[PDB]
């Protein structure tokens, strides 16, 4: 499914609101300021992920490997480059109760590989 992104007008750069062509019964994104219209391409106008199926690997960034306060381990090498050393940390993010899962990052420079056991 995936979320639904905002579409902006090309004249005033304002947000396009969803609307239907009553005669043709087709979804359009029309501007609430000027008279611009666009033919929708997703057909979905709203998506709310209540279960919050978020992959924290996307929130993690390679720069976290430069943190000296994080623990390092040699037992989990990096699969993308083979580097042995890697930092590991918890999610520590709200809305994630099962935060005891460990997320690893490769300490090698220019690799920044992220993964999870």
């Amino acid at each position: 499914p995936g979320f639904v992104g905002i579409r902006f007008c090309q004249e005033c750069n304002n947000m396009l609101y969803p609307k239907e062509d009553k005669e043709n019964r087709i979804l359009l994104y029309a501007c609430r300021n000027c008279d611009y219209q666009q033919e929708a391409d997703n057909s979905c106008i709203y998506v709310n992920k209540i279960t919050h199926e978020v992959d924290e690997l996307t929130q993690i960034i390679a720069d976290v490997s430069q943190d000296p306060t994080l623990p390092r381990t040699e037992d989990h090498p990096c699969q993308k480059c083979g580097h042995k050393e890697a930092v590991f940390f918890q999610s520590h993010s709200a809305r994630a109760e099962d935060a005891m899962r460990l997320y690893y990052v490769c300490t090698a420079p220019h690799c920044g590989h992220r993964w999870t056991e």
Partner: protein, 50 residues
């Protein structure tokens, strides 16, 4: 404390004083014990009014 690492839930990091008074408390243990003492002092100085 800054002496520990992030996401450290070990007894020492979380304030488990493994030393006895006679043995002496390591500085971190001392600080955590001071925290607990603070808690007791506040409770004693607060309950009175109510």
């Amino acid at each position: 404390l800054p002496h520990f690492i992030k996401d450290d839930y070990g007894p020492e990091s979380r304030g488990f004083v493994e030393n006895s008074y006679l043995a002496g408390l390591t500085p971190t243990e001392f600080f955590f014990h001071a925290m607990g003492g603070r808690e007791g002092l506040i409770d004693t100085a607060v309950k009175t009014a109510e």
